[PDB]
């Protein structure tokens, strides 16, 4: 799951570590299993999560 | 006290052509080209050329001096050229030039034959003296060194080919 999430995060312009830190800041608790599932299946949903993580990181 | 800072003049009608690199010099003797460093800046006056380095780092000081020396050598060679004078000493040691070919008899069972490149010439004012004359200091020195190494001087009796005037220590072999 970590590997797949990393690939998806890179495609969204972010590293896995940055994405997880951003999600923690944004209060997102979705775990790595669900994150990898979204990355493979629901690219749009994963992109929304990545946008929120980047926003939290910027703040 | 710095070769890199010292200015270089353009005597007579020596001309210089510029380019991103690969500076060229022309004059009475001929043409030359060297790919100087991209960091040393060359400033050109009507007849004077100077070199500048970006900073005072070890590398910049070193390369500044080297480029200035190289450019100065090119100019002096284009104007007057360079000559290496060799004086062979021996009972039957002799040299003779047929055009660009130098034939040396220095005691070997066979004569030694040397060929100058188009940029160099051999004078041979006498059978015991040779002068390598050219435009490029590097090539002149290299050819002169090769001629000397054919049969370098020896200490016991002074025999061999010598650079004219070079000190050659001599041993009192019993």
């Amino acid at each position: 799951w970590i590997a797949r999430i990393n690939a998806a995060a890179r495609m969204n312009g972010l590293s896995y570590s940055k994405l997880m830190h951003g999600l923690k800041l944004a209060e997102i608790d979705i775990n790595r299993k669900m994150l990898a599932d979204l990355a493979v299946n629901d690219a749009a949903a994963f992109t929304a999560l990545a946008e929120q993580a980047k926003d939290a990181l910027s703040k | 006290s710095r070769i890199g800072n010292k200015v270089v003049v353009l005597p007579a009608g020596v001309e210089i052509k510029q380019d991103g690199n690969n500076i060229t010099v022309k004059g009475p003797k001929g043409e030359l080209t060297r790919e100087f460093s991209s960091d040393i800046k060359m400033n050109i006056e009507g007849n004077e050329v100077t070199f500048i380095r970006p900073n005072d780092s070890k590398e910049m000081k070193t390369i500044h001096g080297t480029t200035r020396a190289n450019f100065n050598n090119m100019v002096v060679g284009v104007s007057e050229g360079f000559q290496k004078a060799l004086e062979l000493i021996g009972v039957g040691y002799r040299a003779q030039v047929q055009g660009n070919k130098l034939t040396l008899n220095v005691g070997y069972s066979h004569p030694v034959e040397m060929t100058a490149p188009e940029g160099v010439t051999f004078e041979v004012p006498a059978n015991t003296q040779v002068i390598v004359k050219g435009i490029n200091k590097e090539v002149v020195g290299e050819l002169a060194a090769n001629i000397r190494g054919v049969r370098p001087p020896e200490p016991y009796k002074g025999k061999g080919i010598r650079y004219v005037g070079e000190f050659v220590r001599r041993k009192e072999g019993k």
Binding site: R4, A7, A8, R10, M11, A36, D37, A39, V40 | -
Partner: protein
């Protein structure tokens, strides 16, 4: 629930990328290329299935060797006969057979198994700026930010 996605052979589309090695350090070029060949850049990555993309390396003759590696990095190989050790410097390999240089570097970074060797076959190295795989419609892959 056992719902993790698992890729299948042949369902996933493998693209074709062109990588320019001009003045890129050998190791860094090999690392990015190895990740691409394994498919680590795609969310569908499945360790037990090949899912990476083909890679074409151009200008292999211009790969970069920092330090004295051009003269000091030595590649050894043993014929398995007594005293049958042979060596060749990395610089000599770059000059004469650059394809072998890149391929050896990438082999070292791929897994040493059936899947790894099959993934390696998807590599294609060419000294020079032209390749014969125009039919595959490869796309440039900028790596300046990946190294």
């Amino acid at each position: 629930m056992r719902t993790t996605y698992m890729a299948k052979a042949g369902e996933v589309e493998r693209k074709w990328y062109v990588v320019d090695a001009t003045d890129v350090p050998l190791g860094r070029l090999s690392a990015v290329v190895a990740s691409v060949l394994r498919g680590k850049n795609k969310p569908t990555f499945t360790p037990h299935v090949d899912t990476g993309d083909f890679v074409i390396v151009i200008n292999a003759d211009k790969v970069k060797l920092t330090g004295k590696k051009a003269t000091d990095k030595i590649y050894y190989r043993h014929s398995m006969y007594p005293g049958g050790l042979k060596s060749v410097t990395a610089g000599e390999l770059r000059d004469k057979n650059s394809r072998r240089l890149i391929e050896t570097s990438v082999k070292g970074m791929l897994p040493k198994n059936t899947l790894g060797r099959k993934q390696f076959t998807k590599l294609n190295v060419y000294g020079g700026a032209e390749h014969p795989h125009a039919a595959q419609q490869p796309e440039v892959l900028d790596i300046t930010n990946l190294i």
